[PDB]
């Protein structure tokens, strides 16, 4: 199960994003996502739009500056360390302590037959940490 590098997980397909699925984090708000655009792949920086259910039945949108450092995809002062990526359906990163599993928007039909280098990492990494679900099938699309 070698991992891609950070970079090739922050631009993934380079289509889509990403939605949080598990987290060992608890309070997290649902439909919580991330979505990259305008790579630059000699620097390896993006435009990262995030956020997570708001009102209305509509996604929050903020955007920062996405970049890397080491093997760690950089938002703002997140750091999230890459444990293990596919580049395409999923990334286990680890930030603030906290162990999260991220589904591409083209994985999340199938949340139950997911890279088993991404669960595997995912379910070795939380130890006896209660997992939390924070994507649910009728979180709405990402933007656009
Ligand atoms: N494809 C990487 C998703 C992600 C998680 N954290 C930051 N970015």
Excluded: M
Excluded at 4 to 27: C, I, M, N
Excluded at 115 to 131: V, Y
């Amino acid at each position: 199960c070698d991992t891609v590098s950070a970079w090739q997980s922050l631009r993934g397909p380079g289509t889509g994003g990403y939605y949080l699925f598990k987290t060992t984090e608890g309070g997290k708000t649902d439909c919580t996502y991330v979505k990259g655009s305008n790579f630059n792949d000699a620097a390896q920086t993006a435009t990262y739009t995030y956020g997570n259910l708001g009102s209305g039945n509509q996604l929050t949108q903020q955007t920062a500056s996405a970049s890397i450092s080491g093997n760690a995809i950089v938002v703002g002062t997140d750091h999230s360390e890459v444990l293990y990526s596919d580049g395409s359906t999923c990334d286990v990163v680890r930030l603030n302590g906290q162990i999260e599993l991220w589904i591409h928007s083209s994985a999340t039909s199938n949340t139950g037959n997911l890279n088993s280098c991404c669960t595997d990492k995912f379910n070795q990494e939380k130890g006896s940490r209660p997992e939390h679900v924070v994507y649910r099938s009728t979180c709405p699309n990402l933007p656009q």
